Amino acid sequence: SDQQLDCALDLMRRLPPQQIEKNLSDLIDLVPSLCEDLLSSVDQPLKIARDKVVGKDYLLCDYNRDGDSYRSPWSNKYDPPLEDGAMPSARLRKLEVEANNAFDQYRDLYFEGGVSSVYLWDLDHGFAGVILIKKAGDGSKKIKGCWDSIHVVEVQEKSSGRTAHYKLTSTVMLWLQTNKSGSGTMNLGGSLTRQMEKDETVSDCSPHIANIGRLVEDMENKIRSTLNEIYFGKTKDIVNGLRSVQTFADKSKQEALKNDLVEALKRKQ
């Protein structure tokens, strides 16, 4: 049933990014023996939890999925009440609380709201973390958007000397809508994923978390940019290439002179 899995992933690849959760559950309802085989490479939105003791929010994924509970980084507690989970290193717990702090600053600077979370775990010669960012559109506004970001980062620290090897994998799951009069309703799905790795020197002024912050910042700038120009301009190009606004036989004139100049440019070769 391995070909069945390949076609299943391609089906999710071509599936409409509006009902990712429901249709993923449906596809799992086909072959439930292949269920938690798909929940590793099928990108879907996030789940907002609620830290009761702190009064914050924290997102849900597999990295915080300790057993079947979730480690709330604002409290380092598990919900459902599992007092047998895998607590992170106390060292990494302090590094994680400052990580959550720095990314709250990051999130507030670019997203001006939204929910974020940064979990962490070990490595033999380093550590690794995940960065969840979920920005839903302004509910008051008509723009029904939902920015979703997941950043798999793996700090492969070298021997000593404080130089590292920062491996990072990201993912953006966009969502957009406008109920504008000129467009009626213009829905706009979309999703990206990239990888980047750099070896920035670690120091007392340049900790690991700062290097990760620069990488996440650059990565999201590239993804948002890349999206907006390449992919969205590509869609605009497709709509313009399908139907043209200019009347034909006028386009035959401009394309006529265009082919004339094609002959002119390829005439003096």
Next chain:
Amino acid sequence: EIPEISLPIHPMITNVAKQCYERGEKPKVTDFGDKVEDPTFLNQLQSGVNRWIREIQKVTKLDRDPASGTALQEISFWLNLERALYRIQEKRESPEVLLTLDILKHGKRFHATVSFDTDTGLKQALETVNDYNPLMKDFPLNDLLSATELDKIRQALVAIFTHLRKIRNTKYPIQRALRLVEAISRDLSSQLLKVLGTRKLMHVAYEEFEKVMVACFEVFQTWDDEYEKLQVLLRDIVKRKREENLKMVWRINPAHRKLQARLDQMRKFRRQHEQLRAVIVRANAIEEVNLAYENVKEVDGLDVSKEGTEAWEAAMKRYDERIDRVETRITARLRDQLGTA
């Protein structure tokens, strides 16, 4: 062993409190009046408080090698730190020092006031002290002090470790516990050294020496099985704490295996003498091997390890060779004694 340094206050403040002491009035903060909100006054106050912070930090962060000195020295050192940090809290809680703090608070200078409790590591030092405070009081090391009988040592070793079992709730470090164990073995070795001294073991018969031998291995087995129980104890402690994957060394070479190995070589040594001296009695090879036996073995000399290998590895295999060469005749002699007929 621990510096206990008092906190000096400015002399004019002492004269003011002295003036209030002549009356019985509590020396108020605003007694200085205009002198409170002045630059040089608060300047000198912060100078004194800053030196106080350095005096506290002089002894709070103090630490030495956990295996430096004997076991009782390190254990008593932690005890000294406990009571000494309480004395630092005593000097902190006096109303005169609080009066200086009130001067800096009333003069809107929050720096020395907040740093008097945060910059001083006395708070965290006292909380760790209190975490180790019941663990350091009523330690049964005296059970190990006057224990000359190996049975007293058996029950003593089990008692001390069962009292030490409360380190599951007080976060005991790994390497600290291992150096602690080696310190325990240090005193065990010292006690056994004088025990072998007051035993006159080189002259007793194999009956009493056999009983003493078995008692020695009794103590050693109490060490091994109870130490494995302490090993499993610390294993589950590290599991319940969930901190990291350090390269923790459990390859412990304590102070008692050093004598245990020599005992083992003597066990097989007595096997040679057992079959021989127990039967040979039954032509002068009988006498002659007991002659050469005692001649190459009567000089163990308080059986320390250093000279043990240093000269006794040669004298040891030399004793083997003295049997052998001495016993060399009997083989071919037996070939005579019975092969002729």
